[PDB]
Design a protein around this motif. Structure first.
Motif, PDB file in Angstrom:
ATOM      1  N   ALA E  29     -11.413   1.373   6.706  1.00  0.00           N
ATOM      2  CA  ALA E  29      -9.996   1.235   6.980  1.00  0.00           C
ATOM      3  C   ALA E  29      -9.234   0.775   5.746  1.00  0.00           C
ATOM      4  CB  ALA E  29      -9.783   0.273   8.116  1.00  0.00           C
ATOM      5  N   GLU E  30      -9.839  -0.126   4.985  1.00  0.00           N
ATOM      6  CA  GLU E  30      -9.140  -0.720   3.865  1.00  0.00           C
ATOM      7  C   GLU E  30      -8.947   0.308   2.787  1.00  0.00           C
ATOM      8  OE1 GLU E  30     -11.232  -4.115   2.430  1.00  0.00           O
ATOM      9  OE2 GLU E  30     -10.768  -5.358   4.175  1.00  0.00           O
ATOM     10  N   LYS E  31     -10.023   1.020   2.479  1.00  0.00           N
ATOM     11  CA  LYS E  31      -9.969   2.010   1.426  1.00  0.00           C
ATOM     12  C   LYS E  31      -8.986   3.067   1.842  1.00  0.00           C
ATOM     13  CE  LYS E  31     -13.312   4.946   0.832  1.00  0.00           C
ATOM     14  NZ  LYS E  31     -12.525   6.196   0.946  1.00  0.00           N
ATOM     15  N   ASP E  32      -8.955   3.332   3.140  1.00  0.00           N
ATOM     16  CA  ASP E  32      -8.008   4.282   3.684  1.00  0.00           C
ATOM     17  C   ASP E  32      -6.578   3.902   3.324  1.00  0.00           C
ATOM     18  OD1 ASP E  32      -6.533   6.073   5.099  1.00  0.00           O
ATOM     19  OD2 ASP E  32      -7.216   5.415   7.075  1.00  0.00           O
ATOM     20  N   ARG E  33      -6.151   2.755   3.833  1.00  0.00           N
ATOM     21  CA  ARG E  33      -4.764   2.373   3.667  1.00  0.00           C
ATOM     22  C   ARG E  33      -4.433   2.241   2.197  1.00  0.00           C
ATOM     23  NH1 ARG E  33      -6.258  -0.944   7.898  1.00  0.00           N
ATOM     24  NH2 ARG E  33      -6.491  -2.728   6.483  1.00  0.00           N
ATOM     25  N   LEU E  36      -3.810   5.764   0.715  1.00  0.00           N
ATOM     26  CA  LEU E  36      -2.538   6.359   1.095  1.00  0.00           C
ATOM     27  C   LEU E  36      -1.417   5.610   0.407  1.00  0.00           C
ATOM     28  CD1 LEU E  36      -4.473   7.486   3.256  1.00  0.00           C
ATOM     29  CD2 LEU E  36      -2.516   7.564   4.776  1.00  0.00           C
ATOM     30  N   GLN E  37      -1.638   4.320   0.212  1.00  0.00           N
ATOM     31  CA  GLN E  37      -0.684   3.491  -0.488  1.00  0.00           C
ATOM     32  C   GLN E  37      -0.458   3.989  -1.892  1.00  0.00           C
ATOM     33  OE1 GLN E  37      -1.660  -0.643  -0.476  1.00  0.00           O
ATOM     34  NE2 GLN E  37      -0.065  -1.190  -1.955  1.00  0.00           N
TER      35      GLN E  37
ATOM     36  N   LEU H   4       3.531  12.219   4.389  1.00  0.00           N
ATOM     37  CA  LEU H   4       2.913  10.918   4.186  1.00  0.00           C
ATOM     38  C   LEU H   4       3.595   9.828   5.003  1.00  0.00           C
ATOM     39  CD1 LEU H   4       2.352  10.928   0.316  1.00  0.00           C
ATOM     40  CD2 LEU H   4       0.639  11.102   2.095  1.00  0.00           C
ATOM     41  N   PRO H   5       2.813   8.843   5.466  1.00  0.00           N
ATOM     42  CA  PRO H   5       3.319   7.609   6.074  1.00  0.00           C
ATOM     43  C   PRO H   5       4.110   6.774   5.074  1.00  0.00           C
ATOM     44  CG  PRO H   5       1.005   7.398   5.613  1.00  0.00           C
ATOM     45  CD  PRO H   5       1.347   8.836   5.371  1.00  0.00           C
ATOM     46  N   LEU H   7       5.615   3.683   2.912  1.00  0.00           N
ATOM     47  CA  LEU H   7       4.871   2.645   2.213  1.00  0.00           C
ATOM     48  C   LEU H   7       4.708   1.406   3.081  1.00  0.00           C
ATOM     49  CD1 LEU H   7       3.576   1.307  -0.246  1.00  0.00           C
ATOM     50  CD2 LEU H   7       5.851   0.874  -1.123  1.00  0.00           C
ATOM     51  N   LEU H  10       2.125   1.554   6.929  1.00  0.00           N
ATOM     52  CA  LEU H  10       0.715   1.261   6.759  1.00  0.00           C
ATOM     53  C   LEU H  10       0.441  -0.234   6.661  1.00  0.00           C
ATOM     54  CD1 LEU H  10       0.454   0.504   3.460  1.00  0.00           C
ATOM     55  CD2 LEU H  10       0.588   2.994   3.284  1.00  0.00           C
ATOM     56  N   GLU H  14      -4.058  -8.371   5.310  1.00  0.00           N
ATOM     57  CA  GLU H  14      -5.441  -8.044   5.011  1.00  0.00           C
ATOM     58  C   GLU H  14      -6.383  -9.100   5.539  1.00  0.00           C
ATOM     59  OE1 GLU H  14      -6.382  -5.178   3.697  1.00  0.00           O
ATOM     60  OE2 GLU H  14      -4.286  -4.555   3.498  1.00  0.00           O
ATOM     61  N   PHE H  40     -12.493   3.463  16.549  1.00  0.00           N
ATOM     62  CA  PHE H  40     -11.929   3.812  15.272  1.00  0.00           C
ATOM     63  C   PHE H  40     -12.751   4.878  14.586  1.00  0.00           C
ATOM     64  CE2 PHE H  40     -12.349   3.093  10.730  1.00  0.00           C
ATOM     65  CZ  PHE H  40     -11.106   3.484  10.307  1.00  0.00           C
ATOM     66  N   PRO H  50      -7.053  10.720   7.751  1.00  0.00           N
ATOM     67  CA  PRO H  50      -6.974   9.270   7.918  1.00  0.00           C
ATOM     68  C   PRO H  50      -5.720   8.792   8.641  1.00  0.00           C
ATOM     69  CG  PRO H  50      -6.463   9.896   5.684  1.00  0.00           C
ATOM     70  CD  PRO H  50      -7.015  11.111   6.336  1.00  0.00           C
ATOM     71  N   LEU H  54      -5.031   5.822  11.459  1.00  0.00           N
ATOM     72  CA  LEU H  54      -4.599   4.660  10.693  1.00  0.00           C
ATOM     73  C   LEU H  54      -4.213   3.485  11.590  1.00  0.00           C
ATOM     74  CD1 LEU H  54      -2.298   4.888   7.608  1.00  0.00           C
ATOM     75  CD2 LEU H  54      -1.670   3.346   9.430  1.00  0.00           C
ATOM     76  N   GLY H  57      -6.901   1.777  12.739  1.00  0.00           N
ATOM     77  CA  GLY H  57      -7.363   1.109  11.545  1.00  0.00           C
ATOM     78  C   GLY H  57      -6.625  -0.195  11.350  1.00  0.00           C
ATOM     79  N   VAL H  60      -8.302  -2.632  14.324  1.00  0.00           N
ATOM     80  CA  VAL H  60      -9.572  -3.227  13.946  1.00  0.00           C
ATOM     81  C   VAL H  60      -9.381  -4.431  13.025  1.00  0.00           C
ATOM     82  CG1 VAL H  60      -9.836  -1.642  12.031  1.00  0.00           C
ATOM     83  CG2 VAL H  60     -11.833  -2.820  12.959  1.00  0.00           C
TER      84      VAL H  60
END
Ligand SMILES: CCCCCCCC/C=C\CCCCCCCC(=O)OC[C@H](COP(=O)(O)OCCN)OC(=O)CCCCCCC/C=C\CCCCCCCC
Ligand SMILES: CCCCCCCC/C=C\CCCCCCCC(=O)OC[C@H](COP(=O)(O)OCCN)OC(=O)CCCCCCC/C=C\CCCCCCCC
Lengths: 104, 97, 114, 82, 96, 318, 347, 169, 174
Positions: E29-33, E36-37, H4-5, H7, H10, H14, H40, H50, H54, H57, H60
């Protein structure tokens, strides 16, 4: 004379090594598995000749999957563009110290 | 294609032109051929490393084998030609090119 | 990086020892002192052709074993494959041929070494 | 009968080579005999470098556990007893 | 003895594989976001830089394909500091 | 500060080869009843530096007949690789965690002797050429069996990484498992390093200091020095690879304190070999190998390939 | 070298070609040639002569460089399409090199110069085998890559092979060098029609192999070599010279004879493609190819060069070690003309 | 032109625990947090894009947060006593510490009360219900071009056969 | 960046410049040593480490030694250095100017017009995520050779064996 005895006897002794996909140990994906898979599913009864016409688009995307040729010409065009703006533009501050390290 | 590949390919082209400019005692040719072999090897391996086309990780080494194998043979012939002369390409018995 | 750095420091170290080896004693080289050694009396001729079939007759066999061990190397990793019975024969197989090759040499009197 | 006799001879002559053929062949014949071999391959089924991707439910099935650890999947404590 | 110890170490190994295998998904999930970031950000920087060009569809996929690709980790670091790139690619191999 | 770590790896070892020379004359002396160097010490200790100074001070002629470039480049390569082979060696913690540094030990060891070939080729002398050639013969002839038996002892640790080789020896030691391969590894290290019964590269009385002759002062010091680098290094290598030890991570130093013993215990043995056996001669040197060592190395090799399957004892590392 | 080893070599040559004819993966093809080579060199070195050695040097040196260029062009193909299956190639700069590599492997001109020489260096056994069995594998792959061949490049070597296969054939005396220029000339006819229709190629191939089996079995039967050496044979065993005449004419393709069947199917195929001029030049030059078969016929059967006396004792002694396969190889290579249609069996 | 979503959309706070500490307790983390997790990844391997998954994501992430919130109020000192032992080794090997795991696993199995999974347990594939549709064509792809007909009848003898040139039959 | 892999490619190519020029086989052996270590380094940069060490071992640690034997059988008095003839040295320079023109083309940053297009820029750009579990792609990738690819093992075994036979049937003839 492409004898294809390996096919008639079904030995398959050679066939496995062929192709980007086709079952690989620990199921490791090819880097370009998808475009390849689509492109081969496109390819059967069409056989060889008409196949170079109709399936061309798929093979094309597969080509760019292999070489990343066009995306490189683009990305090169951008990076070379940026030099012109280098005095007219200061780009982005964060790259240097942004939230990208907070990001994970 | 990234410039590095172009560079190795060119190393191949030199590894051939060197084989064919071909001069004096022929031992140089077995060298130049082996250099050619090495360039093909490296050019293969970089590719198999590129796309993670994993099965083909086996090929380069296998390539290497036979290629080295023939070169291993080649010296033996040179021995024989060296055996009657003290080698030089400049001396050939056969007629009609 | 890491390894390239140690390579450079090693080679530069050695080269440093060379330079302090030559440009230091600072004395008189001269002819005949610089003549090649030959247990006293002068050489009957510069080095030429110590020919021997008995060199390559085995050395080539070296080369064709070394290619073989090159195939032996994958073995430790191959040992953990999911299907050893498919593997194991081959794991033995090459070794047999390795031995077999040797065996063939062993008794065609092709292995006179020396 | 007599063929056994020149083993005494070769053993007198080239012992190194004799031991070599001994274990060298024995290493080939023996392995099929060992039961542990069936376990041996089995162990390497057990260890999963790759992730175990979940399958969607679709009417019972039902040997696939729906986690937590439903006692429906393969046992592995047999290995634990080793 | 080698048999005993080796088997036991196989057990602690497989347990370690369960450990990582439990960790994995959220890293995914982290690498994902994060991907995309970075892609978004660099796209915006494209909107600034290439905007001067009279003819330039911005951010166009080179492919006919609709499907997602997971970008080559070249464009994804299209403007990053050199040090970040050294961290990006060679960073494993050059790591001891 | 990685650089000072490297420097910290290179200075102490050179000091070690010097004092290795001195120990060599010492022990090898007492085998002969006669005392070794002594008068300059008081216990001889100051000797090796006096020795090296005697060399580097002394004039190193550039031979008239020799091509100069090869003649200089060879020693450089000798010390180079002799030192470079040391880097990935777990003591306990390797300076570099190569994924497969053992194989790299073989790589360095295999480029080593090539320097000998140049050393005798550019030297131009008759003795140089003949001795260099036979030298390369014995060397390669031993590297094949070398690398095979090293393979067979590596099937069971798991993988080519070195640190794991500690982990796989947390009890019994590898040696009890496969000592005969340890014998052949030992002797192959006794010949690859060009030592006592396998003495030919130096030739000595057979060929008056062999390939090494025409080299005078400094380069000679380099080949000499590098030779001892390889001897202590293959010794250490054997030590970690066939003789495990207790290792508490909290006190790594303890382990090293043990390790230098276990390796020094090997190096001394070469000297105690040197005092014991007449050299083989180039026929028999290769005879015993191709005829006698090798087939056992193979039979043992299939055997070790086959144990992990029959015993269901396959080592962990992926 | 004892027969038990010789036969293993020759069988591993057979295997080393069969492998090319089986495998679809490219790497196994390059392995096919590669294994073929190692097993081909030693068999040239039986008896062993100061001459034979440099013969094998020629052969190895060219085959090695050919195999090298081939593997390079494979790798380039993979670089630009990521495949290993034979099929079409996807990059002309690579494709032309695969054509070149194979062009050496057939010995087509202007790569041809090694073949007349190598033949000179070996006995007619190893010679025949070299001119027949070695011609299979590279053709065996060309038939598989006929689909994408760049016809211009193929027809140019295909023609030039016929001219060089001609002019270099008028000049020589000793037969082996002539057999070399015969084969080097027929390969022009095989590789010519290849872009257009492979089945005609394989037909022509079969005829060629049958033919050269006929000749080399005859030269073996008489142990003739230099033309004059052949000249004496009319008195001792008149039949076989009286049969070399015919097989030679079948090389020449005089129309009742079988050897006409190749050309006359080839001319058909190319003519469907238009391309009308090329077969005319080709067929005209094939005449030039015929002429030295005729002169060689004059040395032999049609006219009696003076016999040497010493021959007389040899009259008492029958030839031995009969070669069973021979008579059929004559007859198939001659009389079979009213059995062209059967060619469609080759589909 | 690629969708794209934003900025922001998302963005999620963290998880920021260090990897060693993470690993020290992850062996339980797989055992407890789960349903969102497998939902997920199953969602991911379905459609490959993805962006589609998301949101799960995100879910989770927050689920894991709740997991540690459950942790810190109870076991912590034993916990820190544990991962500190582990982080000390650069191999992160479980074998080096272990004994503390007695402390930690016991304090959890009592004070918060639930068992550690056995070594042979997490690896097995899990059944997972889900309401959202499995995607039509995840590759998107295109049409499959119409195959050549495999037309056939039966073989009447050739009309005159071998019609080439002068041959009659 | 460092372009270190690329400059290694450059030293590689000049390694073939001094190598393909033909000045006594021994110095050419040096040429393949330099090109060899450069080679293993270059392939090491993509992390196919096992292979780079194959060539650094199997090739250079094997071949060029046996060539260090052929020269003992060939040599001839007064072997030529690169500087020892106008055609040899002329050849070496002839390589240098060409490869340097290629580097100048790299300065041009334009796609190469020679033979076929070279896309330019740094090497790193083509890399993709190397994500994996506790195993390199290479490891199991070559480990596959035995279990999953027995056929090649058969033909290589057979080939090398009968190659030994060929060496016999050449050398014994004398
Ligand atoms: C006369 C002059 C004498 C000069 C002597 C110089 C001889 C040096 C030759 C030695 C070259 C061998 C270098 C190979 C090093 C190596 O294999 O590193 C292993 C290591 C394993 O890593 P992994 O575990 O697989 O990945 C994760 C690890 N963190 O590989 C790496 O990761 C590092 C990669 C960096 C590439 C650096 C390669 C350097 C090559 C330099 C060759 C130059 C040759 C020039 C010689 C000139 C002599 C005339
Ligand atoms: C471009 C390629 C196309 C080729 C063009 C035509 C090819 C047909 C010609 C092929 C053979 C021609 C010569 C070959 C043999 C030869 O040169 O013989 C010369 C020889 C000289 O003597 P020596 O052999 O040197 O020794 C003397 C010892 N007492 O004398 C001869 O035999 C010459 C006479 C025979 C050949 C004459 C053939 C007749 C003309 C040939 C083609 C004519 C075309 C037909 C006309 C119709 C037009 C459509």
């Amino acid at each position: 004379p492409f004898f294809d005895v390996q096919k008639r006897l079904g030995l398959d002794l050679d066939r496995w090594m062929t192709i980007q996909s086709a079952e690989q140990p620990h199921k490791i994906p090819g880097r370009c598995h998808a475009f390849e898979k689509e492109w081969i599913e496109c390819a059967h009864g069409i056989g060889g000749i008409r196949a170079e016409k109709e399936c061309k688009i798929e093979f094309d995307d597969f080509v760019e999957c292999l070489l990343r040729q066009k995306t490189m010409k683009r990305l090169s065009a951008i990076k070379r563009q940026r030099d012109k703006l280098i005095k007219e533009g200061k780009y982005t501050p964060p790259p240097h110290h942004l939230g990208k390290e907070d990001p994970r | 294609m990234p410039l590095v590949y172009m560079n190795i390919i060119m190393a191949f082209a030199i590894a051939l032109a060197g084989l064919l400019m071909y001069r004096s005692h022929l031992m140089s040719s077995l060298l130049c051929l082996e250099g050619m072999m090495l360039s093909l090897f490296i050019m293969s391996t970089l590719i198999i490393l590129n796309t993670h086309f994993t099965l083909a990780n086996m090929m380069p080494i296998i390539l290497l084998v036979f290629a080295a194998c023939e070169a291993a043979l080649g010296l033996s012939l040179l021995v024989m030609v060296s055996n009657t002369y003290g080698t030089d390409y400049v001396q050939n018995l056969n007629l009609l090119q | 990086m890491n390894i390239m750095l140690t390579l450079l420091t090693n080679v530069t170290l050695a080269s440093l020892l060379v330079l302090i080896a030559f440009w230091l004693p600072q004395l008189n080289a001269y002819s005949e002192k610089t003549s090649p050694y030959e247990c006293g009396f002068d050489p009957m001729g510069s080095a030429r052709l110590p020919f021997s079939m008995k060199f390559f007759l085995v050395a080539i066999t070296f080369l064709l074993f070394d290619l073989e061990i090159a195939l032996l190397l994958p073995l430790p990793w191959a040992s953990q494959t999911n299907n050893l019975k498919t593997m194991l024969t081959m794991a033995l197989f090459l070794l047999i041929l390795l031995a077999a090759s040797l065996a063939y040499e062993w008794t065609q009197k092709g292995l006179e070494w020396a | 009968g007599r063929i056994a006799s020149f083993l005494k001879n070769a053993w007198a002559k080239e012992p190194v080579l004799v031991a070599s053929f001994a274990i060298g062949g024995l290493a080939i014949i023996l392995p099929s005999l060992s039961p542990y071999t069936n376990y041996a391959i089995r162990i390497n089924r057990a260890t999963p470098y790759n992730y175990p991707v979940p399958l969607r439910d679709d009417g019972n099935m039902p040997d696939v556990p729906s986690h937590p650890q439903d006692p429906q999947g393969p046992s592995l404590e047999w290995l634990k007893n080793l | 003895s080698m048999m005993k110890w080796n088997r036991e170490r196989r057990r602690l190994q497989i347990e370690d594989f369960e450990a990582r295998i439990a960790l994995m998904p959220l890293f995914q999930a982290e690498k994902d976001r994060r991907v995309l970031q970075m892609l978004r950000e660099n796209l915006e920087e494209e909107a600034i830089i290439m905007k001067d060009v009279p003819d330039w569809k911005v951010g166009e996929s080179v492919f006919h394909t609709t499907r997602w690709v997971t970008p080559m980790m070249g464009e994804l670091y299209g403007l990053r500091t050199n040090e970040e790139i050294l961290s990006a690619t060679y960073g494993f191999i050059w790591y001891t | 500060m990685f650089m000072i770590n490297i420097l910290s790896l290179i200075i102490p070892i050179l000091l070690a080869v010097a004092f290795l020379t001195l120990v060599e004359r010492k022990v090898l002396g007492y085998m002969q009843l006669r005392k070794g160097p002594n008068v300059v010490g008081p216990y001889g200790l100051l000797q090796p530096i006096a020795d090296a100074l005697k060399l580097f001070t002394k004039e190193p002629l550039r031979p008239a007949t020799s091509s100069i470039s090869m003649f200089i480049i060879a020693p450089i390569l000798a010390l180079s690789l002799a030192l470079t082979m040391w880097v990935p060696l777990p003591m306990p913690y390797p300076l570099i965690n190569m994924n497969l540094g053992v194989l790299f030990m073989l790589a360095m060891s295999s480029l080593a002797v090539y320097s000998i070939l140049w050393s005798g080729w550019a030297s131009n002398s008759k003795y140089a050429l003949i001795g260099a050639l036979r030298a390369v013969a014995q060397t390669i002839s031993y590297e094949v069996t070398l690398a095979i038996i090293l393979l067979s002892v590596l099937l069971m640790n798991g993988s080519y990484t070195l640190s794991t080789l500690i982990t796989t020896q947390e009890h019994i030691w590898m040696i009890f498992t496969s000592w005969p391969l340890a014998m052949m590894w030992f002797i192959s290290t006794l010949a690859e390093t060009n030592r006592a019964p396998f003495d030919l590269t130096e030739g000595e009385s057979e060929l008056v200091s062999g390939f090494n002759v025409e080299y005078a002062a400094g380069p000679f010091a380099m080949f000499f020095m590098a030779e001892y680098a390889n001897i202590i290094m293959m010794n250490a290598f054997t030590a970690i690879l066939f003789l495990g030890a207790s290792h508490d991570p909290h006190t790594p130093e303890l382990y090293t304190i043990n390790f230098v013993l276990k390796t020094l215990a090997l190096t001394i043995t070469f000297l105690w070999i040197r005092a014991s056996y007449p050299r083989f001669r180039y026929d028999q040197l290769m005879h015993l190998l191709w005829k006698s060592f090798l087939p056992l190395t193979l039979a043992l090799c299939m055997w070790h390939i086959s144990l992990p399957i029959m015993t269901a004892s396959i080592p962990p590392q992926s | 070298m004892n027969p038990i080893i010789y036969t293993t070599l020759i069988m591993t040559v057979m295997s080393g070609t069969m492998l090319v004819m089986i495998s679809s993966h490219w790497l196994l093809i390059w392995i096919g040639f590669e294994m073929n080579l190692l097993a081909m060199i030693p068999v040239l070195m039986k008896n062993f002569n100061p001459r034979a050695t440099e013969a094998a040097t020629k052969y190895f040196l060219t085959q090695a460089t050919a195999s090298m260029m081939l593997m390079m062009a494979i790798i380039i193909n993979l670089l630009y399409s990521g495949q290993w299956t034979i099929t079409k190639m996807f990059n002309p700069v690579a494709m032309t090199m695969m054509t070149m590599a194979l062009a050496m492997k057939l010995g087509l001109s202007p790569f041809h110069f090694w073949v007349p020489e190598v033949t000179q260096g070996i006995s007619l056994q190893a010679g025949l085998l070299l001119l027949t069995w070695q011609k299979l594998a590279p053709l065996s792959v060309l038939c598989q890559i006929s689909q994408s061949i760049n016809p211009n490049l193929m027809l140019t070597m295909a023609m030039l092979s016929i001219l060089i296969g001609g002019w270099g054939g008028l000049n020589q005396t000793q037969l082996r060098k002539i057999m070399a220029y015969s084969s080097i000339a027929h390969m022009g006819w095989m590789t010519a029609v290849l872009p257009y229709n492979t089945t005609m190629t394989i037909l022509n191939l079969l005829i060629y192999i049958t033919m050269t089996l006929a000749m080399f079995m005859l030269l073996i039967h008489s142990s003739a070599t230099t033309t004059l050496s052949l000249s004496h044979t009319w008195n001792k065993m008149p039949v076989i010279t009286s049969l070399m005449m015919v097989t030679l004419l079948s090389m020449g393709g005089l129309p009742p004879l079988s050897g006409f069947m190749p050309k006359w199917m080839i001319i058909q195929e190319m003519t469907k493609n238009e391309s009308i001029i090329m077969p005319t030049l080709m067929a005209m030059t094939a005449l030039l190819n015929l002429y030295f078969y005729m002169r060689l016929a004059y040395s032999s059967s049609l006219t009696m060069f003076p016999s040497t006396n010493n021959m007389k004792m040899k009259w008492q002694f029958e030839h031995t070690k009969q070669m069973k396969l021979l008579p059929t190889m004559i007859v198939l290579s001659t009389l079979v003309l009213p059995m062209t249609p059967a060619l469609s069996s080759l589909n | 032109i690629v969708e794209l979503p934003t900025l922001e959309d998302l963005k999620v706070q963290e998880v920021k625990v260090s990897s060693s500490v993470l690993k020290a307790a992850a062996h339980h983390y797989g055992a407890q947090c789960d349903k969102p997790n497998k939902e997920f990844m199953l969602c991911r391997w379905e459609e490959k894009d993805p962006r589609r998954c998301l949101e799960e994501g995100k879910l989770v992430n927050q689920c894991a947060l709740d997991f540690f919130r459950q942790i810190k109020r109870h076991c912590a000192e034993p916990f820190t006593e544990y991962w500190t032992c582990i982080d000390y080794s650069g191999l992160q090997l479980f074998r080096h510490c272990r004994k503390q795991q007695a402390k930690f696993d016991e304090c959890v199995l009592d004070k918060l009360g639930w068992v550690r999974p056995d070594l042979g347990e997490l690896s097995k594939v899990t059944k997972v219900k889900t309401d959202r549709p499995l995607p039509e064509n995840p590759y998107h792809s295109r049409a499959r071009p119409e195959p050549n007909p495999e037309a056939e009848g039966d073989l009447k003898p050739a009309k005159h056969g071998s019609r080439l040139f002068f041959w009659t039959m | 960046t460092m372009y270190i892999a690329f400059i290694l490619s450059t030293i590689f190519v000049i390694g073939f410049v001094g190598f393909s020029s033909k000045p006594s086989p021994i110095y050419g052996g040096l040429g393949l040593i330099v090109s060899g270590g450069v080679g293993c380094g270059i392939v090491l940069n993509f992390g196919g480490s096992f292979l780079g060490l194959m060539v650094f071992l199997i090739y250079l640690g094997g071949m060029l030694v046996v060539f260090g034997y052929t020269t003992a059988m060939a040599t001839e008095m007064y072997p030529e250095v690169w500087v020892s003839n106008k055609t040899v040295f002329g050849a070496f320079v002839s390589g240098l100017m060409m490869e340097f023109c290629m580097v100048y083309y790299a300065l041009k940053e334009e796609e190469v017009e020679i033979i076929f297009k070279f896309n330019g820029l740094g090497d790193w750009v083509i890399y993709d995520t190397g994500d994996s579990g506790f195993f390199s792609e290479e490891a199991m990738g070559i480990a596959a050779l035995y279990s999953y690819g027995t056929w090649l093992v058969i033909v290589t075994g057979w080939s090398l064996l009968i190659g030994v036979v060929v060496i016999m049937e050449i050398t014994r003839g004398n």
